[model samples]
Target chain A: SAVHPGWPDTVGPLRVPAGVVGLRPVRMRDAAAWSRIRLADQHHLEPWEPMTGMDWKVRHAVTSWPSICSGLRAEARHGRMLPFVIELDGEFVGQLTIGNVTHGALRSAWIGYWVASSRTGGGIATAALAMGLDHCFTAVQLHRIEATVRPENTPSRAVLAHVGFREEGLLKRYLEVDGAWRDHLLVAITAEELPQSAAHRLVAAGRAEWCAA
Target chain B: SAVHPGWPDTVGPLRVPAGVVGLRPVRMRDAAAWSRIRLADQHHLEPWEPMTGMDWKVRHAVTSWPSICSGLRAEARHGRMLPFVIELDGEFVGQLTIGNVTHGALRSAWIGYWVASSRTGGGIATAALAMGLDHCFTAVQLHRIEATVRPENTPSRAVLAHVGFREEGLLKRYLEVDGAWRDHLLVAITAEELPQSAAHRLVAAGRAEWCAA
Candidate 1:
């Protein structure tokens, strides 16, 4: 297939240089690798992932790669969703996405991310978040980027906070999870509130590799 | 085009029999009548409507009704939207719609409605609400239907409450209204909680006749 102008043919499009943890558009070819890591981490990650809706689709995706790939392709083509495969030195480790994009007056979107258990605690998700946000503001020209986390998911909340998202409110039964509705903490950051020197902050934190140009 | 098997067609496919006030699918033909009432009520309803997004479209729809009507037709055909014209004695006086529908594990949607000020307090709006709720639950089979109202918009709040909508919470800066972001009270109703007596109430109000589908 011909490449989209300006997107790299090698990585399939944009790349977020997140220090040792790299980010690239999740491709259909990565389904096998994605399946292995996700299934292997099922018991490990169930505590945090949405359990009701996509669980079956995901279970199918693990065995039939085409099932999920088609869904991802349509989303990416629509220009609102950006699904990235989180990698370490070209090794697949996790997945991250910016979804539910609304333009015009709202100019906002939601972010969701997950990393393999073996890759947690290394600041990978935070670094990836910073880079994803940079793309949202710069390339996508979105004004607000928000995230919702389970209040008990401390690690996820910490990652959002690290990227300067503030806890704004609570939504009761906002999402169906674990076969029932669950409350989620809404956190968000607007482009106006993001400091111009965020790249320098990444540098100071030794995440200079993901710093915007 | 073949009609989807279950959707109503007689009144445009289905009609909500609400004594003096009836409900049917919104159509392009109703544009002229819709426009006059909307323009007549512009100043009266401006304070309650969203200031951003659709304000300009409404203005445009007043001038070129076909443009906005075309958009509504496309949305309705897609199944995610169900726009209904609220009628009294075969005249189109207002609109009541359940839009932004999502059918999956969540089975949720958002509803917005309006009625001409001339018809206020005549029990028309309340009857329309009850009938609309019945269609959403039985025909659409949506598990939840929600609405957002400006805090200071007391009349709308009362109408919602009269029809059994409970205030769930408040959303700060929920929507742009009359040129600024405003807080809104979130209200929702679930299928399990719907009272069957609501239908009897609609029938007892007046001798209703619906001429549209």
Candidate 2:
């Protein structure tokens, strides 16, 4: 039996009485909707986005979509990344990535996400993160899932805690964000720390439900 | 001015009343001595070596030397590694590597080393490690240097402590050693932790001397 079923697999359209949220492999077909949503949320998202040396408008331009998708797909095939688009009712509203996957004795990876400003405060990111963590621990067979957040980003920290991640340590100048290196609070949840599935934990808390695919 | 003077550069021939220890780029010419020393040290070194799925004899065969040297050199050229041969009085007595060199914000790398069993207890590892850390912080401009050791590796742990690495945490099943997954103690030292160069600290403590290159 293969220990890893492989990546780029769809997770779910997790539902609540309010709406549906899920994760799917990012596609070239998503270019139009992705660009539209991202551009509209530029101001709200830019402050936290990873710096790429290119302006947001240029980096997300239609001409750049093909290279972006290809790069992500290539990394997925190499087993180092799971790049997904966050969908609310089958429409791309944001993105979530479980990246930097390492196997062997260290079966761990880091998760990152964003939701459109217009779609915030409705539990969409929380649902998508829970679903992603469930997939990571199950199909991905990972021992640990880590998430690093800017200390000032209270909303994101709340989302991680809601999914059972524990604050581990502070990493100084951990990553480049918004054109400068920023310190991040490292948080992680190992499989042992989450005997109950993250998705089930949310469901038990009346936060969301896993809709059968 | 370039931030990184680049890898494959020589670090030292650190000296003491006892003997001289240094780090220099590993070369194809060193293949014969490398394999000879490694095969001779097999029993003493194998338990802590990372598993490569190849038996020690097969992995250290003369034919494998070319590939090993080329692979390491390629990674060094890419700036992700600094592969060095530890020298005692200009003789290749061991190997030390500063690998997974991460720049951009995170500016850190992990160090791994081994000295010939016959060369143990002479402070060679201590001298080499201090020289490597000094180069990493000053010339390479890295913020941190980390070293992981098996809990039972009392000698290596002592060397790390002598060079100022603080025990950070125990990583469960952190690496595959011998043929099975093994737990390791994660220890690290940031540049700020050593106000003076690591080599200077060693010299000031009457442990070693820096030989002018």
Candidate 3:
């Protein structure tokens, strides 16, 4: 029916550590690493998010994976958010979400992601986002994608920049982060703008605008 | 407790059409007028809003009225949008809304409104807006209030300026409106900046710094 849109298809695995494999929609079996990444990175993530109602010290990162999975299931049904797990060689590295999806006359999605501190600076998140975008725009036939970044999150912004998302504008107080709304800088790219290769080289070749309509 | 935060103790009323009167947050028996306003203005309101599933054409406007009562019944519901009708020269002229409400740390609300086509320029909306602002700031203990108007909607921009909101900045492609995301000029005012009277002289004086901050 209507192609039953899904992101980070239920097949294929992202490499991790200890022979553990990254799974799509992150299952209960991988909740340990998922919880670990969330707790260890609470400070890092809090700046961009609202305070959680649960204790962050608990396993499963104080979030009910069942509930998360349920919402993800529903969102997937609605063709919205795609959930993912990161495997470093074999162990869990982190996770990411590509959300704010839109369809109908205008097809678009936004990306949000994080990597475990222990696995920082690796290409896993980058790989995950790229693969997820291809799934969303290429497979799902979306036309546009957006990423919201705080001006201070240079690393995250750089990731998107590397992915060829051009900065659109600085929105004052765009997100309700850290128990208060904080501003975000919006970056966006449309299917009409990119090449099929890695985003960095696409922009570097300056061919970005060459065939762009 | 906490003085029923943001609920107003008194509001001015509007007289119209042989016996009907208009008041904000109507009591139970006020269902008839509510139905008329909702039915008359339903189509007119659609083009200005983001998609909403709430149906407005039923008798008693039960869904609509209950929604209003529920908002007023609950305190700390800052995001609630409340609107009022117009009854001037003994006729139901139109209605208006104060939206994007914030309580707690921000204590701010944004005013957005429209008038029935036949009643345009009657000054009914402007008077109604004045009442709404007073309810928001003095009665509700809010600090700031703002409104956004499409730059192209000159008449609306004029109405906002005439009431008290000062032009602040241009927001590019601010909302997905009328089948397209359109740009708008943000206008705003603060409680402290506005004198009790919002006549031309007072509005002119407070207009600058009101939006600047």
Q: Candidate 3, residues A1-213: lDDT per residue as tens digits?
A: 153465435322322222212334554445555676677787877677644655556525535666766676567656666666654433457676767677789888787778776666655555656656655666677898888888988888877776677899999978776766788999888886656446534223322221111
Q: Tens digits of per-residue lDDT for model 2 on B132-213? A: 8888888888999999999988888888888789999999998899878899999999988776545457744433233111
In candidate 2, position B99 carries an lDDT of 90
* Local distance difference test values of all predictions, in order: 0.66, 0.77, 0.59
Candidate 1, residues A112-190: lDDT per residue as tens digits?
8887777544766776677677767766678999999989788888878877898999999987766677899999888
Q: How well does candidate 1 score on lDDT at residue A8?
A: 16
Taking the tens digit of each residue's C-alpha lDDT, what string does model 2 give over A105-174? 9999999998887765488888878878878888888999999999999889898888788999999998
Fnat of all models, as shown: 0.00, 0.00, 0.00
Residue-level lDDT of model 1, residues B56-107, one tens digit each, is 4457365667776666656666666777777664457787777887777998
lDDT of 3 at B177: 69
In model 2, where do residues sit more than 4 Å from their true spots?
Answer: A1-213, B1-4, B196-199, B203-213
Clash count, one per candidate: 9, 0, 11
Q: In lDDT terms, how accurate is model 2?
A: 0.77
* DockQ score of each predicted structure, in the order shown: 0.01, 0.01, 0.01
